[PDB]
Every structure is written in structure tokens, then in C-alpha cells.
Short mmCIF file of C-alpha atoms in Angstrom, two decimals:
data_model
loop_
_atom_site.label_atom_id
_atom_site.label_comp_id
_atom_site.label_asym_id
_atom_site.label_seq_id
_atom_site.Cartn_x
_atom_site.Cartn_y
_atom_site.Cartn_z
CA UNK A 1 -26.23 14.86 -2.12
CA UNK A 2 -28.81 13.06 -4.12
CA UNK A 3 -26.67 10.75 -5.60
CA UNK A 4 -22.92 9.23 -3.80
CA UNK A 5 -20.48 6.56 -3.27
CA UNK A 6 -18.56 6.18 -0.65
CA UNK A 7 -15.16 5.56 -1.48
CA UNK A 8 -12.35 4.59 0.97
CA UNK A 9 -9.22 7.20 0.21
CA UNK A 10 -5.77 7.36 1.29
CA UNK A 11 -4.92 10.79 1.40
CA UNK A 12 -1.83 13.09 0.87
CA UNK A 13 -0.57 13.31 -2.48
CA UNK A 14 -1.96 10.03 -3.76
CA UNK A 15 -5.82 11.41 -2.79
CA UNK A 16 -4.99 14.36 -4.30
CA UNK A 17 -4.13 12.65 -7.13
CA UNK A 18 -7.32 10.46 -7.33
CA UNK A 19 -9.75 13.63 -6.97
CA UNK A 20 -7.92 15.11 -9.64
CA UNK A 21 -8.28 12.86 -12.08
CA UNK A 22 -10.97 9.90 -11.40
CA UNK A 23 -13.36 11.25 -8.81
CA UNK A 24 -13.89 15.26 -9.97
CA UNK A 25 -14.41 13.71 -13.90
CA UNK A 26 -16.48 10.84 -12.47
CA UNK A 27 -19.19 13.56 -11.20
CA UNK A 28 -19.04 15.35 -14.04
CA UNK A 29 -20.07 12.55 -15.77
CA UNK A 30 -22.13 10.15 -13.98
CA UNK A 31 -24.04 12.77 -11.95
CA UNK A 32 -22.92 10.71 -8.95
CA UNK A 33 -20.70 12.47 -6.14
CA UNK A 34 -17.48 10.76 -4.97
CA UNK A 35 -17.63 11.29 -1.23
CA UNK A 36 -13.85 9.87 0.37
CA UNK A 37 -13.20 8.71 3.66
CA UNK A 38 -9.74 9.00 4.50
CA UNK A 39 -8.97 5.73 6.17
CA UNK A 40 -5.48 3.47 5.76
CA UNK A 41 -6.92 -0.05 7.03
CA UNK A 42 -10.31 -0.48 6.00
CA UNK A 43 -10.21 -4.43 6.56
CA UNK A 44 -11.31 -4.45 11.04
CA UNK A 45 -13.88 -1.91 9.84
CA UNK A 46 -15.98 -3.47 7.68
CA UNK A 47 -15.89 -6.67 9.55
CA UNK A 48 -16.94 -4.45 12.30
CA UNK A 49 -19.84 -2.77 10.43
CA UNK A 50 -20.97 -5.69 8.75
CA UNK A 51 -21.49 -7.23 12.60
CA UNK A 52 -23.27 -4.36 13.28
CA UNK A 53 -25.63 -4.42 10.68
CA UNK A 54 -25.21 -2.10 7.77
CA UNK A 55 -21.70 -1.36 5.68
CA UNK A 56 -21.17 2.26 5.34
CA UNK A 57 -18.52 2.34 2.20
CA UNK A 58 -18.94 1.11 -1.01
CA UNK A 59 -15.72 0.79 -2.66
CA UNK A 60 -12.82 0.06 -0.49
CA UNK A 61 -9.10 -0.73 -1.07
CA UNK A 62 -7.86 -4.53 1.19
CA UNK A 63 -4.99 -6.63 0.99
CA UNK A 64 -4.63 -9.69 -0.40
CA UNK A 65 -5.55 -11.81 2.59
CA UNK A 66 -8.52 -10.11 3.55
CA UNK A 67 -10.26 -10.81 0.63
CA UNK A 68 -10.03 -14.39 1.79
CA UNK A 69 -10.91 -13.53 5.14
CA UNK A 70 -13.90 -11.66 5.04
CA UNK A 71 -15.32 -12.93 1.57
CA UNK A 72 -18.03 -14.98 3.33
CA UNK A 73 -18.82 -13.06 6.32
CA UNK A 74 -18.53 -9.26 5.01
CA UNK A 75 -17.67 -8.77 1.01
CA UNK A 76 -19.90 -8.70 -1.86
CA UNK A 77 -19.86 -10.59 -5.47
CA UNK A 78 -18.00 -8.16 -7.83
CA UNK A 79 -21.00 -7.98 -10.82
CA UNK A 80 -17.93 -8.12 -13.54
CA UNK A 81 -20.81 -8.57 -16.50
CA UNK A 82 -21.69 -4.64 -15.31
CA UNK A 83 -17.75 -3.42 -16.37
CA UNK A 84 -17.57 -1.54 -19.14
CA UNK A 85 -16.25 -2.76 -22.54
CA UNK A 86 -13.10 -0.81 -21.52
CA UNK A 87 -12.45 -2.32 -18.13
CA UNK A 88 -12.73 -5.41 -19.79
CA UNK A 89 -9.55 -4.57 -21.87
CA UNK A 90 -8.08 -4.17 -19.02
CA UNK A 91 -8.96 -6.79 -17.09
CA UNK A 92 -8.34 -9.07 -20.06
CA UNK A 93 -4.23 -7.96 -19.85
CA UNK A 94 -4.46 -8.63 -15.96
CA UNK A 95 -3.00 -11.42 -14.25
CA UNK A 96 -6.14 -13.97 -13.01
CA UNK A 97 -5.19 -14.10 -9.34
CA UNK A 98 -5.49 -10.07 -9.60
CA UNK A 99 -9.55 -10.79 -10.45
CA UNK A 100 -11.45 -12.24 -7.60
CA UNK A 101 -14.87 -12.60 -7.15
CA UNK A 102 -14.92 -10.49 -4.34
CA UNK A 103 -11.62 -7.85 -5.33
CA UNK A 104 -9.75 -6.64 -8.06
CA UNK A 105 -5.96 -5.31 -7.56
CA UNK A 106 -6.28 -2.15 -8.88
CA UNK A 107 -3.20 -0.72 -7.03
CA UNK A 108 0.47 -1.92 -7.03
CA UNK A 109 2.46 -0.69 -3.74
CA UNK A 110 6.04 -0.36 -2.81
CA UNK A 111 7.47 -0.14 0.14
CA UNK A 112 10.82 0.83 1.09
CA UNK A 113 14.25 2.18 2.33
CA UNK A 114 13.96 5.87 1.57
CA UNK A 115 16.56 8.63 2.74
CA UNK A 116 17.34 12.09 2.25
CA UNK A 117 20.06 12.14 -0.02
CA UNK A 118 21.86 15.44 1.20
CA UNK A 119 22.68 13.77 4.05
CA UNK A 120 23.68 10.20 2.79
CA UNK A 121 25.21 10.95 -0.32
CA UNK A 122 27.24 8.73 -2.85
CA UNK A 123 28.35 5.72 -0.63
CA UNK A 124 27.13 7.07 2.38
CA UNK A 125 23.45 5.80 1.34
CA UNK A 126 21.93 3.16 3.44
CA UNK A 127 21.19 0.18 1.70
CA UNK A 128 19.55 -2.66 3.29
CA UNK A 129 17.81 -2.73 6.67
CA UNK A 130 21.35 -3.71 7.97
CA UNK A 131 22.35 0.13 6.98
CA UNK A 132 18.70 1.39 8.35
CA UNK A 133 19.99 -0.39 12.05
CA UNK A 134 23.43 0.85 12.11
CA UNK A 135 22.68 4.15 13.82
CA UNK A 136 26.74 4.46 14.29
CA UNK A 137 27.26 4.53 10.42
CA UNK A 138 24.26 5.64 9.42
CA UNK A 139 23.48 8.84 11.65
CA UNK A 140 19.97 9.93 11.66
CA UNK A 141 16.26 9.86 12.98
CA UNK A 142 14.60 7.12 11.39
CA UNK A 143 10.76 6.29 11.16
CA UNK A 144 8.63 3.54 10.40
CA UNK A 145 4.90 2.64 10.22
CA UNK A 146 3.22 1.10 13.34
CA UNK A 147 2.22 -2.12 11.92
CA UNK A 148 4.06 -5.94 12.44
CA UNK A 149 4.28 -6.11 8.65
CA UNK A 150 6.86 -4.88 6.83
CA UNK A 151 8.69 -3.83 9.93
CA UNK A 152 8.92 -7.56 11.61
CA UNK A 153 10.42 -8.46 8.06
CA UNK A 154 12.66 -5.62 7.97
CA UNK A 155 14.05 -6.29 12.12
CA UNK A 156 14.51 -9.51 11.00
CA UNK A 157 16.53 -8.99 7.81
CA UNK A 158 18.64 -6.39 10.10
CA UNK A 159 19.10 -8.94 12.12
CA UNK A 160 21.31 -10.69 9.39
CA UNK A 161 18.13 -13.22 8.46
CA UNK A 162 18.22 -13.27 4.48
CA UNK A 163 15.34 -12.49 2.54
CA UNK A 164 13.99 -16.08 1.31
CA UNK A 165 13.52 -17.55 4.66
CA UNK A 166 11.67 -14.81 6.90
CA UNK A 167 8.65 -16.94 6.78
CA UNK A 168 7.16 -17.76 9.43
CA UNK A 169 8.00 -15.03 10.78
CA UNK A 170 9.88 -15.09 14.16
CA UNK A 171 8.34 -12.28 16.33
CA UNK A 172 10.12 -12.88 19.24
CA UNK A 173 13.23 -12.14 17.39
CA UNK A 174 11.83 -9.14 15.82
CA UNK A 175 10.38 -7.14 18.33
CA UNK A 176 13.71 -7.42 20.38
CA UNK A 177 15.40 -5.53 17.13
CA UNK A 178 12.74 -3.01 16.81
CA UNK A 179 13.42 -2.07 20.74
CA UNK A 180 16.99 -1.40 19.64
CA UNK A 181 16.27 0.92 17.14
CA UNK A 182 12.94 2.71 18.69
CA UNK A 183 15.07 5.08 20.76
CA UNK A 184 16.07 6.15 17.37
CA UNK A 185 12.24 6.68 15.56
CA UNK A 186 11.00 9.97 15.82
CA UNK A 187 7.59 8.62 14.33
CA UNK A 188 5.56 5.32 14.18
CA UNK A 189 3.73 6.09 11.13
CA UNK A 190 0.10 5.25 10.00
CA UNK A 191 -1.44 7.27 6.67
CA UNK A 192 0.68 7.73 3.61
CA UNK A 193 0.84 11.90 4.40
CA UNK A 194 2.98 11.45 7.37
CA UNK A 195 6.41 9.78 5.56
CA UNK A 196 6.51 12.44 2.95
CA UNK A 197 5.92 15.62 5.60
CA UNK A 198 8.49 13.97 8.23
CA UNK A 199 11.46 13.56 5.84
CA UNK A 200 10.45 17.09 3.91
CA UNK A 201 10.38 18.58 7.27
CA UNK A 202 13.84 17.07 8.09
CA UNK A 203 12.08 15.45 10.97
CA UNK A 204 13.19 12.27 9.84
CA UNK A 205 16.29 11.28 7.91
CA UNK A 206 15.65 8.05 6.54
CA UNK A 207 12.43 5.77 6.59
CA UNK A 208 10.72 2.66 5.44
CA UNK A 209 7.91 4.20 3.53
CA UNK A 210 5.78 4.47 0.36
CA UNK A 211 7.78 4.25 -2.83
CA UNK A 212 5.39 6.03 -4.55
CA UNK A 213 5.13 9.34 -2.80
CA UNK A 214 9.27 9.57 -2.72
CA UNK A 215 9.45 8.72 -6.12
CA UNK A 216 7.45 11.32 -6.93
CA UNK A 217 9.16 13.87 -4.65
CA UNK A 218 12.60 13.16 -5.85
CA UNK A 219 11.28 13.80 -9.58
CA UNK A 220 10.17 17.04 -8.22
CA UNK A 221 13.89 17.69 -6.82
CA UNK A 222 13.43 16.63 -3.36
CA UNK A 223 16.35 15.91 -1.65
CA UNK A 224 15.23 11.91 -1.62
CA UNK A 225 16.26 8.63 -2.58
CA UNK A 226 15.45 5.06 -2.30
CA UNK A 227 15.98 1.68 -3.18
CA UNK A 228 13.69 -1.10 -3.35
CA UNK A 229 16.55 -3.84 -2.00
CA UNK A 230 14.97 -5.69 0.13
CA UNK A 231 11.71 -3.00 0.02
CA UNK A 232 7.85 -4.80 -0.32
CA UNK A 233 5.75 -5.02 -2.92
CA UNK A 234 1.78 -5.81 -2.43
CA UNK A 235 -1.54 -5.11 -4.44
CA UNK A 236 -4.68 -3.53 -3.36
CA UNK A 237 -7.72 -5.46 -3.82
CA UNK A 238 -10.39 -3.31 -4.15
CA UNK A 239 -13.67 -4.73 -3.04
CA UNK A 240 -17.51 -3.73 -1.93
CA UNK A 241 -18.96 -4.61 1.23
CA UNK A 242 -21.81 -6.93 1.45
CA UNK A 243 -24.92 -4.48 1.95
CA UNK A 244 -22.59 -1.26 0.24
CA UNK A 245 -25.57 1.59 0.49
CA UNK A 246 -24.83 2.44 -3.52
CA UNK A 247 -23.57 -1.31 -5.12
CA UNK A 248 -24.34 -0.13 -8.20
CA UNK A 249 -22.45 3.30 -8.16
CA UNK A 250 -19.76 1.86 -6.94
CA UNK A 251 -19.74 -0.78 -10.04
CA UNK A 252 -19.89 2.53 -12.01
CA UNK A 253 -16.86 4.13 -9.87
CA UNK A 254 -14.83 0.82 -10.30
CA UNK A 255 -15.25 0.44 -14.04
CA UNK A 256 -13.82 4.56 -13.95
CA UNK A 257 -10.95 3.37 -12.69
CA UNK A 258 -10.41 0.47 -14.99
CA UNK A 259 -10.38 2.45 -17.98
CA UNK A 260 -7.11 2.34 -19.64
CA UNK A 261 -6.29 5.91 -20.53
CA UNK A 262 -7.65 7.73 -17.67
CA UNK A 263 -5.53 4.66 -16.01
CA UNK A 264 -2.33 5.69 -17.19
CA UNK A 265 -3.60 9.31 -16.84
CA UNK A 266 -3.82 8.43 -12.84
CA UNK A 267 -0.44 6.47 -12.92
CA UNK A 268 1.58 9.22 -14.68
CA UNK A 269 0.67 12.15 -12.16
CA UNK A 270 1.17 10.08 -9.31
CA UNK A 271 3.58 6.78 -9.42
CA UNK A 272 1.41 3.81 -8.31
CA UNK A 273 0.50 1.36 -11.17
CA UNK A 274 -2.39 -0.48 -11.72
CA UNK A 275 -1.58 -4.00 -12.62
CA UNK A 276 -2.31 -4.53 -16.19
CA UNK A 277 -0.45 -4.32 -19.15
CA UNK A 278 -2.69 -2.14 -20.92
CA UNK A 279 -2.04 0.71 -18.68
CA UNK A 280 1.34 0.53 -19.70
CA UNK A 281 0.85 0.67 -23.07
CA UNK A 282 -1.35 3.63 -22.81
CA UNK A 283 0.97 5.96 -21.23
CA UNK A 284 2.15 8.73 -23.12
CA UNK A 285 5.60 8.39 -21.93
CA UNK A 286 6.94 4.79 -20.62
CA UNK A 287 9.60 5.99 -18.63
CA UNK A 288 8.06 6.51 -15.20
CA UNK A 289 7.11 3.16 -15.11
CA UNK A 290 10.51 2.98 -13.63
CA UNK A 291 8.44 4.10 -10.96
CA UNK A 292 6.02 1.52 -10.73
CA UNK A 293 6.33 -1.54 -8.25
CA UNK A 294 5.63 -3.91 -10.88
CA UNK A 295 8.74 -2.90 -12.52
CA UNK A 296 10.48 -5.84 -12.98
CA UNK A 297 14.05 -4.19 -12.14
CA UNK A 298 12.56 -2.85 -8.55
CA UNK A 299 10.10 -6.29 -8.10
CA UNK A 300 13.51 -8.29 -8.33
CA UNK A 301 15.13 -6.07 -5.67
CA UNK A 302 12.09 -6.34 -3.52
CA UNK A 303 11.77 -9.10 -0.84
CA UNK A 304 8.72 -11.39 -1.62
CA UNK A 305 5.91 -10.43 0.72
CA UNK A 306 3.57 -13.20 2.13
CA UNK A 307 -0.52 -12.12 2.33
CA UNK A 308 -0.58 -15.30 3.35
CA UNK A 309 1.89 -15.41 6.64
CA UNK A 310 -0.03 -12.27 8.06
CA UNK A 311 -3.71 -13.50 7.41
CA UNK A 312 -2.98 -16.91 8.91
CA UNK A 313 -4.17 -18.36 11.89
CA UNK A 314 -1.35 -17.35 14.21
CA UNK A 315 0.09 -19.32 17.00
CA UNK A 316 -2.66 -18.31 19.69
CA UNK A 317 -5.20 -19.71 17.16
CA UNK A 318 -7.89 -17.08 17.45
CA UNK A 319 -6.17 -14.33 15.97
CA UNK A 320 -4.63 -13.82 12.27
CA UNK A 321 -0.65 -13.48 12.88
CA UNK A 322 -1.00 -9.80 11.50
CA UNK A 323 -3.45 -9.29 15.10
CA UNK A 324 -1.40 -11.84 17.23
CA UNK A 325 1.75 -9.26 15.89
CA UNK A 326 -0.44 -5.74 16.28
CA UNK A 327 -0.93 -7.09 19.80
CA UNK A 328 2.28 -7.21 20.60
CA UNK A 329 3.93 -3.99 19.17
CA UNK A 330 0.85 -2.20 21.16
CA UNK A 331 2.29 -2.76 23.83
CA UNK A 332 5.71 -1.75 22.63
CA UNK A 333 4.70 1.86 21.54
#
């Protein structure tokens, strides 16, 4: 069209979500189209287009560490002066190491221990990663995303390691686990659609997946249920390439998404919170911030996760420990 942004989207319910309410109302308003690219890990991307000359997105959602990592070589300065008045309520009731000058954590995550709850009922619910293991107590097809995060720490904490001391991380240890449950894992996931369809779908029984999405579905009556013990919490930074095509629309798209109310419009038709008080206290009803992963109740179950362990220089010195781990569960799958 005449006038775009190109904003990085994760699909399934949670895009759905997003178009619903932000991007659809943006274009009516703005005159600018929201066009998404469905992508789950932006970060290897835009370093790779920014070597090759010319970013393609202009908003995108990183973690944590990559803000760090590719601030210099790859991300833009965030132009905070050109935020609405709104955004800057909302900004003003965010924690400061949630505003960078090259991301803001728009997007709290949870991940964790999800199962259907026909099949595990009352005390036959898995609990910890322990439970997730035991394929003898616990019977069931399991799945679980194809990445070293969240899955090395979960190995490990099967493995009887307790949650305050799985850094740094031992892969080693934790690839040997994952190669005793693998027989068992009908799916090595990668976009946020897939957890949701394989455990609707009875494909899977139990996995370690996106809080959000289950949450949802077992509001809805799904036969689901979770727990965040020993589950992950992270934020997404959200952040514009160096060279973005349409800097300034995406300013415009990112100061959308910072208003309050259409913030806790977003976050109470589909359960992932943006990190600022304010958004709380515009929501119409409080109670499904049960929901949220900044809950305090769920954040104290939760394990604390380390940005920093998986963007560090990892043992082989020329790879982040998230690559040096990617590495080796390629050539596991």
C-alpha cells in the first residue's frame, strides 16, 4: 500500500488477538497499514539483514539479551520524545530496566508445565519437570519447543538440580536427559500455534508451553491446566532495526500499543500483560490478571530465567551459549 509498517507477529491466537484490537484500529486511524510477518525469533534475522544492507521490519519483538547484543551493530535509538502523552503514562508506571534506548518490554511471557486435565486429574497432575520425566507415572506424549532454553533448564531440574543453581548451565548434563525423554515427544515445537493445536488435538498430553494461550483455553473450558512451578517468565523487548524502511510509523505503531486502555483492552482478550502498572489499573475487570506472568503468585512459582546465561559468550568463545546450545540439540533432532 501507500503507507506500512512492518511489524514482526507471532501468530495463532495471540496474532489474532493483536489484529483485532491494535493493528485493524491502528489503520483506521493513522491511515498507515499494519503488514505482519509471522516470525518467532526475529533476533539472527536482523543481524543478518542488517549485514546485508537494508532491515526489512520495523517493529520487532527480542529478548532481553539481544538488545545488548545487537544494539551497536543492528538496532536503532528508540525516539521516546515522539511517544504520545499516553505512552508516557505508561512508561512512567514501568520498571526502568523495561525502557532501553534501543527496546521497550512491552510483553510479559510465561512459560510452562501445561497438561490436559482429563487425563491427569486431581493428584494425578504433573507438577514439576520431575513429573513431566516420569513417563511411568505420568503416562503420555509430551512436547516441547526446539530451543536450549527453557528446555536445558527444565532437563536439568528433572534431573533433581534445584531451581537457584541451574546457572551456568550444564549442557552436557542436559542434553543426556532430553535423549531420555525424546522417544516420548511427539513434537519439537517452534511458533506459539503449534502447543495449543497439539494438546487440543490430543496429539500431545502434556507440554512445556505458552502460559498464555492455555490460560486462555482453559477459561474457554478446554480440558487444560497448568502451573507455573518451576515454569519461565521473560519480557519482550520490542525494538526497530537500524535502517527500519518506516522509523517513524513504527514510532506511531509503538506509541498504539503503549496506550493504557487499548492496553488492557489487548491484555483482557488475550492473557499476556504488558509490564506496567497502569495497564492494570485500566482493566475493566482485575481478575484475569491472575493470568498474567507478572502476577506475583505465578512469578514466585516461576524459576528465575537468566537473559544473561544464554546471550553470553559461551565456552567455545565465538558463539553466545544460546548458539553454542542450538548447535548441539541440532544435531539431536
Amino acid at each position: 500500500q501507500s503507507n506500512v509498517v512492518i511489524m514482526q507477529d507471532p501468530g495463532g491466537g495471540y496474532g489474532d488477538a493483536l489484529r483485532k484490537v491494535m493493528y485493524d484500529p491502528f489503520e483506521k486511524e493513522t491511515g498507515i497499514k499494519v503488514v505482519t510477518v509471522q516470525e518467532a525469533r526475529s533476533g539472527p534475522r536482523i543481524k543478518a539483514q542488517a549485514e546485508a544492507g537494508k532491515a526489512q521490519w520495523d517493529l520487532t519483538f527480542i529478548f532481553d539479551q539481544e538488545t545488548k547484543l545487537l544494539g551497536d551493530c543492528c538496532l536503532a535509538d528508540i525516539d521516546y520524545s515522539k511517544l504520545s502523552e499516553s505512552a508516557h503514562k505508561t512508561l512512567a508506571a514501568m520498571p526502568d530496566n523495561l525502557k532501553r534506548k534501543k527496546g521497550v518490554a512491552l510483553q510479559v511471557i510465561g512459560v510452562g508445565l501445561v497438561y490436559n486435565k482429563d487425563k491427569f486429574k486431581g493428584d494425578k497432575a504433573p507438577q514439576t519437570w520431575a513429573d513431566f520425566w516420569d513417563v511411568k507415572k505420568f503416562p503420555g506424549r509430551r512436547c516441547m519447543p526446539a530451543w536450549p532454553r527453557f528446555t536445558f533448564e527444565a532437563a536439568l531440574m528433572a534431573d533433581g538440580v534445584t531451581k537457584d543453581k541451574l546457572y551456568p548451565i550444564d549442557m552436557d548434563r542436559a542434553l543426556k536427559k532430553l535423549k531420555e525423554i525424546k522417544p516420548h515427544v511427539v513434537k519439537w515445537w517452534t511458533t506459539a500455534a503449534q502447543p495449543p493445536q497439539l494438546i487440543l488435538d490430543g496429539e500431545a498430553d502434556m507440554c512445556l508451553a505458552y502460559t498464555g494461550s492455555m490460560s486462555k483455553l482453559a477459561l474457554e473450558g478446554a480440558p487444560i491446566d497448568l502451573t507455573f512451578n518451576q515454569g519461565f517468565v521473560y519480557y519482550d523487548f520490542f525494538s526497530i532495526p537500524k535502517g527500519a524502511p518506516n522509523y517513524d510509523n513504527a514510532l506511531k505503531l509503538l506509541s498504539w500499543r503503549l496506550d493504557p486502555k487499548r492496553a488492557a483492552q489487548l491484555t483482557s482478550t488475550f492473557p499476556v500483560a504488558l509490564p506496567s502498572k497502569v495497564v492494570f489499573d485500566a482493566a475493566t475487570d482485575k481478575n484475569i490478571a491472575r493470568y498474567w506472568a507478572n502476577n506475583p503468585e505465578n512469578v514466585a512459582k516461576a524459576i528465575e530465567w537468566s537473559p544473561d546465561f544464554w546471550g553470553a559468550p559461551s565456552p567455545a568463545g565465538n558463539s553466545t551459549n544460546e548458539e553454542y546450545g542450538q548447535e548441539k540439540l541440532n544435531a539431536m533432532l
